[PDB]
Symmetry: D2
Subunit: 499 residues, 4 copies
């Protein structure tokens, strides 16, 4: 006998006891007489159109694939619940935080960023950690990563950043020139690049890394008072990372290391968990913060803004069918219930649009009707209708226009968003020159120790060495801006690689 993941089929068979196998049918439900031999004219004659068993099956096979996620294509999913352990109702009226002991079902998907569906799990890259809470007030999607920050601070640079991390448009090869030219030209990336090339760049599976909302969000209480916050979900299994050596080995040995690690852990009752915390910053404090409180390349020092306990995230259920439950999972940062709102963070603002948008393309206009994406703990009632692949009853014969005099769904003023005053010109304000080095300096010499600083520089050099010399120079200049030694150590390694 072997690991549970390996015995997937064996277990499916034994669980079907002595039940006779079902009758094999066409998509239309017609029993099939023989699905192993095609309908031909004579033993060695041509195939007939009349063989609709063949066409029915082949036509479906021909349409099995859907486009992969534009980013975070390689991933793993699991399900479980969220449980409130502490009272934060003074900050947010969100039903999900309603009362201690309150449980809400959740869906989670882990993933890498740049690699396609067939890529390896154990590679250096940020890690997606999206959590879907099916609440009474609809779904709340906390689409986070294994890092509290990111490489850029304005959504207009996202497509270009992703492109630079992907393949060359002509050769279809990973291109260090594209990678470092972009990062060297955009030093705001220094903070996350430092995180990326540290030990945390390659977590050991998905159970040994933390999750972060990254962005500054807004919480609103029952009295309509608002504060800004940040979400943190620390792994209860402890932080564990893979060495560059073992990561590379597993890259070919088991491209799906993260997938099987998670499935087996849950299958054996070793359910992984995370503790959800929040940091709170009042509007007054946000106006005095030394940097842009809504700058995604910045963190909120824990000493000034301590973590507040909220609850626990537990994954105790594996998907039964990956494609249906994980490949089709759709997380939308715009999916926020009353009590939780976005901040003016330029990046988050862009994500408000991008996710539902790419989902309408990747899955389809009615992707929210796919079981895993349905807010099944809520009652979806509105004036939206039709669209391709419309399931259910399309809200039946209910009046489809609002307002109406026929008792159809009514909006609820209780759900109105919190109001903030803004004053300024409609312009494209430059954020390229906000502080790009201060917090990186503290990360380098305060957060990391001597051994991980050495590893950090070797990891960077090992990749930067493949870029052109003028790019290497520019990149080293930025690192030096953070700290002379940071750049010096990298430069020293580059001179070696450069023979």
């Amino acid at each position: 006998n072997r690991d549970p993941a390996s015995d997937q089929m064996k277990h499916w068979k034994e669980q079907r006891a002595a039940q006779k196998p079902d009758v094999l049918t066409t998509g239309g439900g017609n029993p099939v007489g023989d699905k192993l031999n095609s309908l031909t004219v004579g033993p060695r004659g041509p195939l007939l159109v009349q063989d609709v068993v063949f066409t029915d099956e082949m036509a479906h096979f021909d349409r099995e694939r859907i486009p992969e996620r534009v980013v975070h294509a390689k991933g793993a999913g699991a399900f479980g619940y969220f449980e409130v352990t502490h009272d934060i109702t003074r900050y947010s009226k969100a039903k999900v935080f309603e009362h201690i002991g309150k449980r809400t079902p959740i869906a989670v998907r882990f993933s890498t960023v740049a690699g396609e569906s067939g890529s390896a799990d154990t590679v250096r890259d940020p890690r997606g950690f999206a959590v879907k809470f099916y609440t009474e007030d609809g779904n709340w999607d906390l689409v986070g990563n294994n890092t509290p920050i990111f490489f850029i601070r304005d959504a207009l640079l996202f497509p270009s950043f992703i492109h630079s991390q992907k393949r060359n448009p002509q050769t279809h090869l990973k291109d260090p020139d594209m990678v470092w030219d972009f990062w060297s030209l955009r030093p705001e990336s220094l903070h996350q690049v430092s995180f990326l090339f540290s030990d945390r760049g390659i977590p050991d599976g998905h159970r040994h890394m933390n999750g972060y909302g990254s962005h500054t969000f807004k919480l609103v209480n029952a009295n309509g008072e608002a504060v800004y916050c940040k979400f943190h979900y620390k792994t209860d299994q402890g932080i564990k990372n893979l060495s560059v050596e073992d990561a590379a080995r597993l890259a070919h040995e088991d491209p799906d290391y993260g997938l099987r690690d998670l499935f087996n852990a849950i299958a054996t009752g070793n359910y992984p968990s995370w503790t959800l915390y929040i940091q709170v910053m009042t509007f007054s404090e946000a106006e005095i913060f030394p940097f842009n409180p809504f700058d995604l390349t910045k963190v909120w020092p824990h000493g000034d803004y301590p973590l507040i306990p909220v609850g626990k995230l537990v994954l105790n259920r594996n998907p039964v069918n990956y494609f249906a439950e994980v490949e089709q999972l759709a997380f939308d940062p715009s999916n926020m219930p009353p009590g939780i709102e976005p901040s003016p963070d330029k990046m988050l603002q862009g994500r408000l649009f991008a996710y539902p948008d790419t989902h309408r393309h990747r899955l389809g206009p009615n992707y929210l009707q796919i079981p895993v994406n349905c807010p099944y703990r809520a009652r979806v009632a509105n004036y939206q209708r039709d669209g391709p692949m419309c399931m259910m009853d399309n809200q039946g014969g209910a009046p489809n226009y609002y307002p109406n005099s026929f008792s159809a769904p009514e909006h609820q003023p209780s759900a109105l968003e919190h109001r903030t005053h803004f004053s300024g010109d409609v312009q494209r304000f430059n954020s390229a020159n906000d502080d790009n080095v201060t917090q990186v300096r503290t990360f380098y010499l305060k957060v990391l120790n001597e051994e991980q600083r050495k590893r950090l520089c070797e990891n960077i050099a090992g990749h930067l060495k493949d870029a052109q010399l003028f790019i290497q120079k520019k990149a080293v200049k930025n690192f030096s801006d953070v700290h002379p030694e940071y750049g010096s150590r990298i430069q020293a390694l580059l001179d070696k690689y450069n023979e």
Copy 2:
């Protein structure tokens, strides 16, 4: 007060009892606070991306439409049941005919042919009369028309025929030159054209016309014996047609005449019904038939092949949501349960491919998972997986390959198709001259009387007059081939027009 159709909303509100209106939500289930005013900075300021209530709703509105059916786009639907009244098990082992009194739920869609979704119901055109039987052996789709024959006998001419009946590729206008150039060049169309321009060309609604499978089909019994057949479902409401004058009036007064007529008939309890019959031809008989038994431009004389009663079709339920239940309805001639099979009819053979093919395009790869199309009376089990908008559980974790040693779905030898012998070279046999006038002559001279013939010729000439003279001549020549008087009567009217 008013007719049931007009009081649709009034009724929905009443059936709603005095319930409180549901809370209006986004597609994600999030309650909306005010869905009548957009989120802006200041009363006369710009719209925010932050307004996700707006985007959610507008994006779905922007995707409401799907491609209309390439043909038969304008239609009406209803639901009911098929009840067996006679025993024909000696001919077919199909479970649908299993025992007297057995009822099978059905779905039916009526339609015109050439017009697009916004066209009028009361126009001269054949009428679609598709019936979906949800049987224990899967769905059986009998996709018939209100005529036992058709204009052509080879599917390769179908796209061209339809193009000729639709809009000119440049002007987007109906084109009599296209219509008659095609018909005059393909005389095999004379039989259906005669029927089309007779009074039956414009039935009074959908309840006063007969239905026909048109094609010759094959029935197989428990002993594996087979016979050919024709399906006939006669209106119990009686044949009734609209005069050209009334149809033209209704065309603008109520372009949805047929839709309204059917909804109200059912809503008032005046359920329309049809009596299903079959004609049976043994294989020996098919070998001696004066024409090709599988030629779609010909009928089987009732005198030589008497109608055998089978059961009744009753429509007693209106759709609740038209888009979900009627617009998305998909009938596939290839959906046939054991006991019912196709004949060599070249046209039918082409249809075996065409419908599932167009449905995967118009609806989606997984169109059979749409509620109204699901064979909900059968257990769908096979090795098909994934595809866009994959609902349910995608068959969970069941082994997905066949054969397998894990108890997944299995054949069913009894379902094997009836084996027939065919001999001959594989080539394109010309069927253009398979007698295009004999049966047309009997229709013109015996089926119709004097006043009917006069109207028939007046209807033809009224439309053919707009074609070029050379086309008029070629058309008249064909009619003359059916009968000299047929031609001269039309010619005399044409001369009066060409004045």
Copy 3:
């Protein structure tokens, strides 16, 4: 010999002189030996999968249709040019207005609003009048209507308004209750309703109606100075409308009356033209205008803001293939070149998102690559890549990320948008009660005369009579709010109708 439209094919043939017919091929370019007879085993045998001539052609036929436009589905198109006749460079720096005599190619599509693709042209409804200018600074899409105003003033009510003007979700029938319940609940619609039910509700074809941008826009000159404007393009053919009786008759005699009239006019050299004017309002004046200058239900009095001539629009070319050049035509209000920008108009703001969004759905992600939609007079260069149906070279091997050090495209500061100042809270400001009667009263009493008011009320009553009494009462109540007589005249007709 008939009209040009009727002789479309006749002319195509004559055009090919003695030139020999092309060889008929498959989509893959393989010559076809016989496209009239399918490949079978014996003259009365089954169809073979081997007949790839059949499958290739049928598979395409099965995919001919695309989703029709969610609104304005029924239309006609033509091409021509825009010629500058006056200098307005003091207001806008747009290249399209660069110098007197400058010509810019244009594409125009006329249409109704509610009817689907098969509906009739001569029905009461607003008329779409979209103009695409292919300028050196990209495409400028002025998506106007034949009216200066609209039914609503906030985009959140648009889907609802459209739903109310379309078919009942259960019966699929036009619904007077839906139409009037919505309008009676939203009095802001009074202005456009009065316009819609006046003689201008049914123009005589597309050449005898004016065009308007409707919304207030912003013009920016070379010195960075800005002013608000309104676009007006008056028909040089004169205003001409159809009587209700003639329109009803044509509804069935020629559903494509508008299409035919436009094609023949151009084919005979009787090219239609419109004179383009603009109204100008300074930011100072906008500050004290009696109404919200960005309220789409309001017009700017010509007495206070006279029309300033700009140029002429002339249509002198008929499309060659309707599907490729008209059905696939896509206009995005967001397509605005430097010198032209949007105003705060909530409705216009919503349209900035909706059109490109619906186009990605209806046509495809790369719909801007469809020839008629390509900004062929500009050099498209950016960092966008891939997507389905990617044509041309997909920008070859050019660096695909910005910024870069490899000489790829650069943004141009001179194209920066004009900066406007805004201040206020972020909230949903109610605009439901922004004076819904003042201008309506002026229209009713001044713009119209006794004869015109008589028909107006008869037209309204003729439709409103089919709504429930409680809806009729509320509707009449709003009309009385405009003017007592407006409501009483309608009420008198209603009483007669209700018996």
Copy 4:
């Protein structure tokens, strides 16, 4: 200076030197002022819907991905020419073989089979080797592999086979139970499995392997005479394979080894070539062949059917944009010009349908209009029209129905397919027992030597050891049927593995 592939951007910049960078525009051609900072109200304010530069770019990014190929997803492409070297016009009248020295442009795509888009190039798996010939008689697609045979002989087993080779439905992990359960239950796979697990299972890049049509095809000469044939294209750069150890290290060091190798070879002028040969078998010989001459699990012995030289395939041009020219490449086995036809091979018959079908889904209905897929050396002219993303002029105003009296395209009888006679009942003939070992014995004992035979068993055991014992037993049983020592050697290693 590095390899050409690495200097892709460097070179693009240089070859553009002496040119000012282009203006960065939106998709609509509107120049952008600042594509690096989003439009907000105030420096730290909300993102505006008015930022259409952002929406236009992000919306396109959100739609960059299309479904990957259902199989053969990971690949590399290149272009070149086919040059005739010998005269085979006695066998085929195809224009592509017309005269010695004649050149026809070609497009080629190499690939693995099971892995997704992000998978490694150097893994054990068959290799795709598809060639598209742009001939004057349309495109001819020779969709070959690097092996002359395949695992199964009936298309109905293909989807199951591919499913067994891919990921487990629930775990999403490679599953040896699925792999070997299928192969052990279907011993016809022994021949190809033996080839797969031999040294040829992991080619050193794409230049050091052969290509085969695999299937028996049919050639028809100018006199209407036909013969059956096999296509063979041998590498001119010699057969070379990767050791299991080196392929494994390359899997993580360079997962795109094959792409890189091909691009650099061509970039440096080391153009790879292959010699195209054919084997000929007369209809008489096919009647007495010791096996089914159309059985894909069989080869035609060279001794009895020697290879006849035809021409050379030379690749001398790299793609300029991978996505447009390679990812979108579509090869349809059904694309065959006059002189080349299919054989009764059950697998080929199925492929005639599957490729165009999957292409309509993966790429779109009009995928043949994508530049790289267009039969640009031919003249496409037919009666097909419209469909989404319709490019070109959609054949303008040409009559769209056939037959017609207006001089539109006509079929050419000389292109009629060769006629063949087939006798026997039309039914599903079992082919599961068509000698599964005879040629496998020859391969094992005669083709391979002791060393490679040793590695063969080690390779099989290394993978088979992960399957359940009952599956191992059945698998070994099959190998023993080929030759007791074959199964014996594997069982020995298996025992050591099972420890």
